[PDB]
Amino acid sequence: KIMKSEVLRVTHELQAMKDKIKENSEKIKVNKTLPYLVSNVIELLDVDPQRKGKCAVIKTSTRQTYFLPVIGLVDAEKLKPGDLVGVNKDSYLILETLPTEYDSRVKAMEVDERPTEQYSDIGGLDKQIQELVEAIVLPMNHKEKFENLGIQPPKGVLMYGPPGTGKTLLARACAAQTKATFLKLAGPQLVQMFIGDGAKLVRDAFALAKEKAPSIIFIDELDAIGTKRFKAGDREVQRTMLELLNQLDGFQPNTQVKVIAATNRVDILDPALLRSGRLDRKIEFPMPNEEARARIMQIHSRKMNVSPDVNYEELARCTDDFNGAQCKAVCVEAGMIALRRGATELTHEDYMEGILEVQ
Amino acid sequence: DYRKKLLEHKEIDGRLKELREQLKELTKQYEKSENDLKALQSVGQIVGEVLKQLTEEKFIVKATNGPRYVVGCRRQLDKSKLKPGTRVALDMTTLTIMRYLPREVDPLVYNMSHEDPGNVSYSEIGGLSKGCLLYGPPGTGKTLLARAVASQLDCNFLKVVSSSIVDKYIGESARLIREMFNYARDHQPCIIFMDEIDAIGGRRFSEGTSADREIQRTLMELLNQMDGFDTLHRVKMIMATNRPDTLDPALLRPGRLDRKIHIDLPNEQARLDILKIHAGPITKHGEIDYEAIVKLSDGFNGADLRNVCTEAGMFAIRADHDFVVQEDFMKAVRKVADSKKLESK
């Protein structure tokens, strides 16, 4: 062991390095304390002919352009044309880069932490919603098993069906089970007055989904803008829409946060929406029958003082060709006039009274 | 007694030599921290532009902010890059010149930055042994092939999206056909991809409106630059689409689309090969039988065959079993594939 006796000197040199890094690593707090302003960064690779070529183009908020190479600490998500970077008074070096927003009108579209309703609020849809509950639970907790089996969850699920069925409050009810950040987005929001806004909205959606923590982005009314016209505004929505499909087709690292979509009608079906990353999960959600409407209306009305003498035959007969949110409006209306009816207990005539009231 | 002390001392020496790797690896990063701290000391540089040069040693610079200045020549650099018309950089002190600043553009960063890695994808396309037509029979994977060679070399990443010929304003897209195809004629190597051409492939059977007439006019520029007065012997275009019925029979002339590659799974060896490359990282019971999966599958989609096989892995993971028997493969590829036949209209 005489040859291994020199390792002690090496360990003393290494622990001496750990003893001497406290000062030069301690000045990181006083030099990198606070970037006083915000400056935009534009990446531009240079060539010096080590003597290697590496540079970047800087633009300050006060419209002043300077010169500086690519510097700082170990960069992994950096080197992109972003904003909100670290900068000193006049040295103009890059110390702390963090991606920034602005145009808060799109950043704060729907800031929801978690909803209140859960999946146990409906009745008679487990045979078709269980695939989605699995498709949101197993890709969140069973990421370890995805390497033994080599499974990548799909990113596009088509939640299509007739309107009024509750395709938004139910997907939100499953978003309560996702436990991730919920972020809504409307179809018509892409149609703006200025040019090129849809690119900023799409790259913003993948900017918060790509940059932020694992979240949930549910969109709706996609059919209202998914028109395949052959000037035209829906062809501009083909520029933005086909741009989004290009970001769901040309991006293999799209294994991150999913993009859930829902269409209120499948009349104008875009044929280019078929792909593993695109809307491949096509589970048909038809109009609930009087039995299913009595189930979702019973579980949605399990909180009000409902009379126990309900055979569901009269309401089952009156509810003809109705939807889920329509019976939800009947439940809410019953909870509205049942107050002014004097009797604190919900009666049986209030069902048809609400059906003929709002419809 | 003596023979055991050599092995025991070899074990003490082993656990003594197995602790250096936990420090000597991160000490390189710790020293790299101070290397960067010594690399961030070059600060205070500004930019400028050169318009007119009077003296060979000292010339006039034009700053971005608007005020103009005059600078000298540094003893290190030479008069090669000092010629006018090249954007350079300056310093706040003495207005010296460290190096120049090569110009660029905004979309040029997008056209010169996207790169897709992966060299095995060229050999993962399955048993598949001036323009190419990739049409849309019941079989997919054209994006995996075009992006497989494109991910292999492609010599560039000149991707042409079918949504880039929108031209919201007056339909003068000829500046973009001649601009981009003029870039293809300028750069000696060039490969062009045209994915989802069915949207811009209107058959103009009836009287088209102003929105259709401009797209068909861009198709007239395509005619005038494919079989007009301009050859395309060196450049190559890849027309990908979805339905082989509305593919502009005027453009279906064999002068442009020489061969036809039907993206399908006809051969048993191609379906078995793609099934094996998609069945790489999957684990399953020792009982293997792929001839039933390949035999029962008739005219299906490749990437959707991956989605059906992984869908059978989800059907098998519903019962949270680590091992996966091939019964759920035959019955889940069977039933789910029959659902794809139902949704194959």
Added chain:
Amino acid sequence: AVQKVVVHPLVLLSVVDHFNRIGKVGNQKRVVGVLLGSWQKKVLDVSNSFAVPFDEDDKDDSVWFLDHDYLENMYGMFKKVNARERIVGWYHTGPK
């Protein structure tokens, strides 16, 4: 390797300080100073320097007294205030 060097008068005026801070003791031997410069480029450029207490013996010439802690502390603090210059060599004021 190195064709020419560049020496600033600041180090020689620091030798004037070597002759100033003597204190009239009667030794005036070859006080050795720690020369600093830029060894990165092919040409050598001395910017500043410092000194270390150096004493020899009267009869025996092989006696020489240097310091490692003072060199690592003055060089450590000097590198902390200015990291663009590092150790290169030394120099003595003796004519022989």
